Amino acid sequence: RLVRIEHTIFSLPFAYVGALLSRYPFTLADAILMAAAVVGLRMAGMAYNNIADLDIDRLNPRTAKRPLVVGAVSLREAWALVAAGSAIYFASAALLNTYALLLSPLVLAIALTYPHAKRLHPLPHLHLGIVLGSVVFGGAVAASGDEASSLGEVLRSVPWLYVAAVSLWVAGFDTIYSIMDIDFDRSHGLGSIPALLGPKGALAASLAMHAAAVALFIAGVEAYGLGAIATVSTALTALVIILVQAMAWLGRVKESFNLNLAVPIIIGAGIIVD
Ligand SMILES: CC(C)=CCC/C(C)=C/CSP(=O)(O)OP(=O)(O)O
Ligand SMILES: [Mg+2]
Ligand SMILES: [Mg+2]
């Protein structure tokens, strides 16, 4: 109704890719706990999304059919989903390691601060980038099995290239997605990149993002061993990132969005067949 937990299947492989590239061993239990942490964080984030930007999502033509606006769900059920998400996440983090639990409020803070980034500065896309960066970071810090000796080790355990890359990718295709909202997001005090500079300039900034995104995905191939079955995943990904940029400049922006759904499936099946 308000939060479809099925969608989380697309956000999972970014956690596992952060866990594997840390090169620390983890158990099946650890993996299940990772998944749980992810569905919790998704639940909290998605619920509090509809909560925070509600007053300005009722005014929007585009989102007048959203739940919590029409009705369907109450504010109570939504807040309940927030508390439940935070709770599941905290539970997973605690069940995992001491460092995972230690960093869990910070990670949750990031995911819950994003919907307020609009009213502050015209870079919410970067914030989403940090958000889907925190699931990679979380996977890494949870990969250890607390095999780590100190916090100075878990922060060195994180595949920083890939989090800083998936971040820029997300920021990119969100910067693209926010073009249809250029009009609405400037009528009100809302902020975004395609509102600051025109839709053309937005695509330009989007180009700069996805460029640096592909740049890092490639740099990781050398920085790590990454075998030869993940180097086709890097290629297939970098390829897809191009089409979503291609379809964008061609005006067909709606198709430029759904193509971003491929790369999780790409690297997801890439994590499978080890
Ligand atoms: C962060 C992850 C799980 C991937 C992004 C998934 C996705 C469809 C996000 C776009 S929703 P968002 O643009 O933040 O919110 P609205 O503008 O639609 O109100
Ligand atoms: Mg909105
Ligand atoms: Mg938006």
Angle between helices 262-271 and 13-20 (to 10 degrees): 40
Tokens of 57: 């999502």
- Provide the CATH topology of domain 158-274: Four Helix Bundle (Hemerythrin (Met), subunit A) (1.20.120)
Query: Residue 147 in 3-state DSSP?
Result: coil
Elucidation technique: X-ray
Task: Give backbone dihedrals phi and psi of 93, rounded to 5 degrees, phi first.
Answer: -60, -40
Query: Hey, which of 128, 168, 170, 257 would you mutate to test ligand 1's pocket, going by the most ligand atoms within 8 Å of its Cβ?
Result: 128
When the candidates are 3.90.1150.10, 1.10.645.10, 3.40.1280.10, 1.10.357.140, the CATH number that belongs to 1-157 is 1.10.357.140
Pairwise CA distance, residues 259 & 242, whole Å: 10
Tokens of 188: 């009100």
Question: 185 in ligand 1 pocket by Cβ < 6 Å?
Answer: no
57 is in an annotated binding site: yes
Tokens of 241: 């990132």
Tokens of 63: 């989102």
Helix boundaries (H) for 53-146: 75-96, 98-113, 124-143
Parts of the chain belonging to CATH 1.20.120.1780: 158-274
The letter for the amino acid at 271 is I
Parts of the chain belonging to CATH 1.10.357.140: 1-157
Pairwise CA distance, residues 274 & 263, whole Å: 17
Nominal resolution (angstroms): 3.6
Long-range own/partner contacts, residues 108-112 (CB < 8 A, 24 or more apart): 108/41, 108/44, 110/134, 111/41, 111/44, 111/45, 112/44, 112/45, 112/48
Judge contact between 22 and 142, C-beta under 8 A. Answer: no
User: Among positive and negative, which fits the CA dihedral 210, 214, 220, 225?
Assistant: positive
Nearest CA among 204, 215, 217 for reference residue 245: 204
Query: Hey, which of 174, 175, 183 would you mutate to test ligand 1's pocket, going by the most ligand atoms within 8 Å of its Cβ?
Result: 174
Cα-to-chain-centroid distance, residue 7:
12
